[PDB]
Design a protein that fits this description.
Chains A, B: Its EC number is 3.1.1.8. This is part of a larger assembly, with 2 copies of chain A (527 residues). Chain A has one domain: Alpha/Beta hydrolase fold, catalytic domain (Rossmann fold, 3-Layer(aba) Sandwich). The first copy, chain A, is 31% helix and 15% strand. Chain A has 16 helices and 14 strands. Chains A and B meet through helix 15 and strand 14 of A and helix 15 and strand 14 of B. Bound molecules: a molecule of 2 linked components (NAG-NAG) (2 copies), 2-acetamido-2-deoxy-beta-D-glucopyranose (12 copies), alpha-L-fucopyranose (4 copies), calcium ion (CA) (2 copies), chloride ion (4 copies), potassium ion and 1 more.
């Protein structure tokens, strides 16, 4: 029976057996007033406090969200769907601590991705028990609001100010500051890590004055706020809020009246209308996401990045070799997870329409030109691979690299990785390669479980990643020092060294995607 | 009818059609008195001179040599066997010039490998017509004596002083100095290139005072004189000469008498006994090779290299990804070109005996230890791959890298490549990978011939190699400047950048085989 006294009252955890040892799991601790009724669309409000013992022995409700129904029965898509009841009552967090209770352990705080429209902390591939067991760190993860319920913005209006889910994340960091010592944690040694939209969140906490003292350092897996899906302009955000009102029958003259009406809608009516607030979407559409609110974010984030206005600390940043491929089967013509998807030039052309719907003809021809100068054989997979690379380079890899250059130009140490191992168990087909999201199970140490059908080479690779992430969190330096590992150099503009993560041999390389990123970073923005 | 006046008289060439253009080929020009009778075992003597027109319209006799009979009927071994009559009358050379006759063309001089026991300039994969056609350089190649006829040594005795075949090569360089302008060549812009023993020859011309003014720069493909097969000690050389005498019935008291007797033997009796002058050989045995003769080589070559005593000029050096694999099927137990050669630990152990016959038990256990710490899966091909790597790293790759560090420490520009493309047509099986010798057909531009069943990607790769070798010869800098190619950095000790040559993407990498070469270079020599 393990009971911890928190600031707001007692909580009871549960003991788990993990690799011949024990971890204590406190699952579903609340960290804010449930955001219901008059609190829908508002900043999270602080927790009242309880007497008696709160039982943190099961995962809580996931936040309301639309679900992926493109591949019913298929584990490759379905593993990302929520595995707890959906509810507006979802502001809870999880804590995994080593047993015996540690004395002053580093804390790793996970922020899930999902486009800021989806996601939940309770997914199997984010289970923190393995990290707590093996590295003796404490792992924390939180649910935060997503979609319109988390990001609806009528900027400047506190009834719906925008960025509510980012404030949810913030309030959970504050909970760790006030409470984690009771669990044997060091509030002075907190590292945020997150993937995709979770990585873009981590990058925005580096920018938010109110987050600066709530953590020590940051890890960004395939995401950063300068990615083109990551931040909505004030103009598109007001437009979206108003389109949502049109569709739900809540157009009014007074803006506060609009929100009042929106608070009477059932969550379903709101979720059903989210896809249509926009005239054309792509598979990467973020209809309701971070905005410049004058509160969480004081100015356009590209300006803060460029002018050095962010927390000074070390970062670890990385991407997967085939980021863009998972998205091609959610609308590009000629793609299928169930065949080899050899597409024509005409199909490639139509795919650019799917992925770059607002872009001029010239803009799209410039993409085709940069990506279809073949080298040179008449390989049939040319157009299929080019489309995946287009989508991965624009959306993930070039923004990650550019975030990393700009951040390290102000004097701090940065480490960059390129993940290139395809899981032996991936249910998606082979042409999709080393997909977006499929490093996460390596970072959380799932292949450390022998029962679990990963190869030996994969266990060893995961074990080494876990040690490098942990050494980064504790010490600021992602080395694996005992096993003659390749030493991981800092990423500097100029040399731009990065480390490859793979099962065969780990390499130091330079200037990842140099020709492609010159295209996306210096030319495409002008288009 | 194309007739050139040389210093020793007129020669007639023949015209070839090559890619819609013409090349003039002068094949089989003599460059020394045939080394027969009282000239066997002596330095080549200068050519008398002829009247009338010498017809250089066919390849000449190849030098006497033993032939590879391990795989009769198999193109993978047989393509390296001589394709002209063998004869002691073999000191001839070939010249390919562009048509029309160039005005002051750079000259590339090819020196073949074969262990200093075999080889010939007339092989199909050394045909210089493609280079002359496409890069407008002049290509020269020579036959030089091999085996005891080329390298028998009773050091200090001019009847058999040693290094005769290296002096054959030298006398051919002198011929190019005196004669190449008549063919439209620039004697001031000569580059030597060679592979394996040919590459070790090129490295020894960098060291020989008498070669310094006979060429401008050097290209070393998988070979350098510090390789452990490349130079015989005085002690083993005298011992070998005397063992040869025992076996042929030529033991005498006076050494000059020994040689006189040796000159009465039929070449066959000499060739038949060469394999046995040594108590145990390996597949890389060089029974009769370069020695320190006080003439060509004034001191131990490792001393000259270390103390900076060599020609100051740029070099281009490289190796193939699987150098050692071709040798495993000439005696390692459990190997076959006709199956996958999965070998046990015990077979690996016996293989070390085949390849390191004079080495202590400790020496061999130290190899097993360095190479069998698996990473980590229980992959069945572990021992098979380890043996190939042992043999390639010791014999080729680490010596090439160490030659390259030491040479560039004295101020000259060096370029290093790692060739990693396996020919689509290789007749050897797949486990042998990117074999020793199979870059040569890329350097000579054979895949430029469309008729010839190479892929498109291979044509393009060869075209780019040919341009980089030609730019190196003409300009000292192996860049391909027109097609946005990866810029090839100079190799410096400290960074040790090298360039990978492959069909997919060309990369700049650092510190090739760093852990393995530390083993072979700093520890193994002590053993
Ligand atoms: C692989 O599967 C895809 C997905 O269906 C096939 O794409 C269809 O091809 C047809 C022609 O029969 C188009 O008119 C359809 O509209 C495509 N369907 C969809 C739903 O996009 C594709 O042709 C297949 N490719 C293969 C077998 O190489
Ligand atoms: C592949 O072929 C080799 C070459 O023969 C096989 O090696 C022989 O294996 C036997 C046992 O039958 C040894 O006793 C022989 O002496 C080996 N022969 C020689 C000539 O070396 C090898 O076993 C085969 N490996 C396979 C099929 O995986
Ligand atoms: C239902 C509840 O609120 N709390 C329960 C507590 O009453 C119970 O005794 C304990 C033992 O498993 O589990 C928890
Ligand atoms: C894309 C954009 O900026 N605004 C869109 C516009 O296309 C649309 O027609 C209007 C009403 O839906 O508002 C929204
Ligand atoms: C600008 C404006 O009209 N604001 C009013 C506000 O004062 C009032 O409290 C609200 C609720 O009835 O309606 C609206
Ligand atoms: C400028 C503008 O108002 N545009 C939109 C139009 O794009 C859309 O087709 C329609 C809904 O069908 O609503 C309106
Ligand atoms: C045999 C010889 O020594 N030289 C010949 C020459 O006589 C002949 O006329 C010429 C034409 O092909 O070819 C060469
Ligand atoms: C290896 C060496 O240095 N010398 C060998 C020696 O083993 C041999 O027994 C003797 C006669 O063959 O001379 C030779
Ligand atoms: C050292 C010695 O004995 N040298 C002689 C040499 O003078 C003589 O010319 C040769 C040929 O008969 O025989 C031997
Ligand atoms: C020291 C010495 O003279 N050793 C060799 C020996 O290794 C070899 O076995 C024999 C020929 O069979 O000739 C003798
Ligand atoms: C934990 O470590 C910090 C410094 O990182 C120290 O100031 C703090 O008081 C420690 N607390 C313990 C050991 O309880
Ligand atoms: C270090 O190597 C050993 C095997 O030699 C292994 O058991 C262990 O997991 C490795 N540790 C890390 C952190 O990679
Ligand atoms: C060829 O070039 C050299 C310098 O590299 C020059 O000295 C020589 O005389 C030239 N000969 C010609 C154009 O015939
Ligand atoms: C340069 O590229 C073109 C194709 O765009 C090709 O025809 C040519 O062979 C290339 N040249 C070299 C030297 O690689
Ligand atoms: C209300 C909005 O109007 C416009 C359309 O393009 C959108 O799809 C949305 O329906
Ligand atoms: C695999 C593909 O999936 C989709 C369908 O439109 C096609 O019929 C095809 O079977
Ligand atoms: C004459 C020589 O004597 C010793 C042997 O080990 C050699 O094989 C050679 O025959
Ligand atoms: C491929 C192998 O070659 C050798 C022979 O000793 C074996 O019988 C086997 O067939
Ligand atoms: Ca999986
Ligand atoms: Ca071949
Ligand atoms: Cl077109
Ligand atoms: Cl670089
Ligand atoms: Cl053993
Ligand atoms: Cl390095
Ligand atoms: K452009
Ligand atoms: Na479902
Ligand atoms: Na034959």
């Amino acid at each position: 029976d393990i009971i911890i006294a928190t600031k707001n009252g007692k909580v009871r955890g549960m003991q788990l057996t993990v690799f011949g040892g024990t971890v204590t799991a406190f699952l579903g601790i609340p960290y804010a007033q449930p955001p219901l009724g008059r609190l829908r669309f508002k900043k999270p409000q602080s927790l009242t406090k309880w007497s008696d013992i709160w039982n943190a022995t099961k995962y809580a409700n996931s936040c309301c969200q639309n679900i992926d129904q493109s591949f019913p029965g298929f584990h490759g898509s379905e593993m990302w769907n929520p595995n707890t009841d959906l509810s507006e009552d979802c502001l809870y967090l999880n804590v995994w601590i080593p047993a015996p209770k540690p004395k002053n352990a580093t804390v790793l705080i996970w922020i899930y991705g999902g486009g800021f429209q989806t996601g939940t902390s309770s997914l199997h591939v984010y289970d923190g028990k393995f990290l707590a067991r093996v590295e003796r760190v404490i792992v924390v993860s939180m649910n935060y609001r997503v979609g319109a319920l988390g990001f609806l913005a009528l900027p400047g209006n506190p009834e719906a100010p925008g960025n509510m889910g980012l404030f949810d994340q913030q309030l959970a960091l504050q909970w760790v500051q006030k409470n984690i010592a009771a669990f044997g944690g060091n509030p002075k040694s907190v590292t945020l890590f997150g993937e995709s939209a979770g990585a873009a969140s981590v990058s925005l906490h580096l920018l938010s004055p109110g987050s600066h003292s709530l953590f020590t350092r940051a890890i960004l897996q395939s995401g950063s706020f300068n990615a083109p899906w990551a931040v909505t302009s004030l103009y598109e955000a007001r437009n979206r809020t108003l389109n949502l009102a049109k569709l739900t029958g809540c157009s009014r003259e007074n803006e506060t009246e609009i929100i009042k009406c929106l608070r009477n809608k059932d969550p379903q009516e709101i979720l059903l209308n989210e896809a249509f607030v926009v005239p054309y979407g792509t598979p990467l559409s973020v209809n309701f996401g971070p905005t410049v609110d004058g509160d969480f974010l004081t100015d356009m984030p590209d300006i803060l990045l460029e002018l050095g206005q962010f927390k000074k600390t070390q970062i670890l940043v990385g991407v997967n070799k085939d980021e863009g491929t998972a998205f091609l089967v959610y609308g590009a013509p000629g793609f299928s997870k169930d065949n080899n998807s050899i597409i024509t030039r005409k199909e490639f052309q139509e795919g650019l329409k799917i992925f770059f719907p607002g872009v001029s003809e010239f803009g799209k021809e410039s993409i085709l030109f940069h990506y279809t100068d073949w080298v040179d054989d008449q390989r049939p997979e040319n157009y299929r691979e080019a489309l995946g690379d287009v989508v991965g380079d624009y959306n993930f890899i070039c923004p990650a690299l550019e975030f990393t250059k700009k951040f390290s130009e102000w004097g701090n140490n940065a480490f960059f990785y390129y993940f290139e191992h395809r899981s032996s168990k991936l249910p998606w087909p082979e042409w999709m390669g080393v997909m977006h999201g499929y490093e996460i199970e390596f970072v959380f140490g799932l292949p450390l479980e022998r029962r679990d059908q990963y190869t030996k080479a994969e266990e060893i690779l995961s074990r080494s990643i876990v040690k490098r992430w942990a050494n980064f969190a504790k010490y600021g330096n992602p080395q694996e020092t005992q096993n003659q590992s390749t030493s991981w150099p800092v990423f500097k503009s100029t040399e731009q060294k990065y480390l490859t993560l793979n099962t065969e041999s780990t390499r130091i390389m330079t200037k990842l995607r140099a020709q492609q990123c010159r295209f996306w970073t210096s030319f495409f923005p002008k288009v």
